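Q: For a teaching handout, I want to show students what a protein-ligand complex looks like in token form. Below are the inputs, and the small molecule is 2-acetamido-2-deoxy-beta-D-glucopyranose. Please produce the holo structure.
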Amino acid sequence: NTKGWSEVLKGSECKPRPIVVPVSETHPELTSQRFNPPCVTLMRCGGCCNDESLECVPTEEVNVTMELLGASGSGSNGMQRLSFVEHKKCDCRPR
Amino acid sequence: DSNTKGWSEVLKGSECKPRPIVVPVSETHPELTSQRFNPPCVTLMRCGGCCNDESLECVPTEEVNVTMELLGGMQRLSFVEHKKCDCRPRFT
Ligand SMILES: *[C@@H]1O[C@H](CO)[C@@H](O)[C@H](O)[C@H]1NC(C)=O
Ligand SMILES: [Cl-]
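A: Here is the structure, written as tokens, with 2-acetamido-2-deoxy-beta-D-glucopyranose included.
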């Protein structure tokens, strides 16, 4: 059935939301290597602000460590614990 | 550290599966862009994640309509959501 307006609004608000991001882009300094999985889900600020002059931006972040399959010291396949920025709070702030 | 995601959780979060994504209303219904909506966007379930093999793409294998109320008075707009996904050979 139909989603009511309150539910629709709550689903479009500026808040942290999961987003799939390429791991290489989160760690550009780890060059000449591949990551498995090559993508991760990170909590990032997302949604719509009620005004064209506002953007949905983080007001609180956190670092989280994820174990991925990447490269070892020899460039072989090996596990890597890497750190990622997640957003914990967000706000509609002027540009 | 209490905030450490392990191998399995990492793999699970990478899956080709339906994921919530924010979509602007004006780029879904291009027949009503002469109007602003409150809210100006919606969350739709859409397929994403990444496949084991670069020659495959994460595509929807099941699709359903969802209706939502939005302020113009109040209007019902219909959207397509993805309920199932699969990695399929890339289309040429
Ligand atoms: C994450 O840790 C780094 C230390 O390198 C720090 O600079 C950053 O502010 C931390 N994030 C928060 C807000 O916890
Ligand atoms: Cl793709």
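A: Two things your students might notice: The pocket of chloride ion (ligand 2) is lined by residues B 57 (CB under 6 Å). Chain B touches chain A at residues 1, 3-7, 9-11, 13-14, 19-22, 24, 38-43, 48-50, 66-71, 74, 76 (CB under 8 Å).
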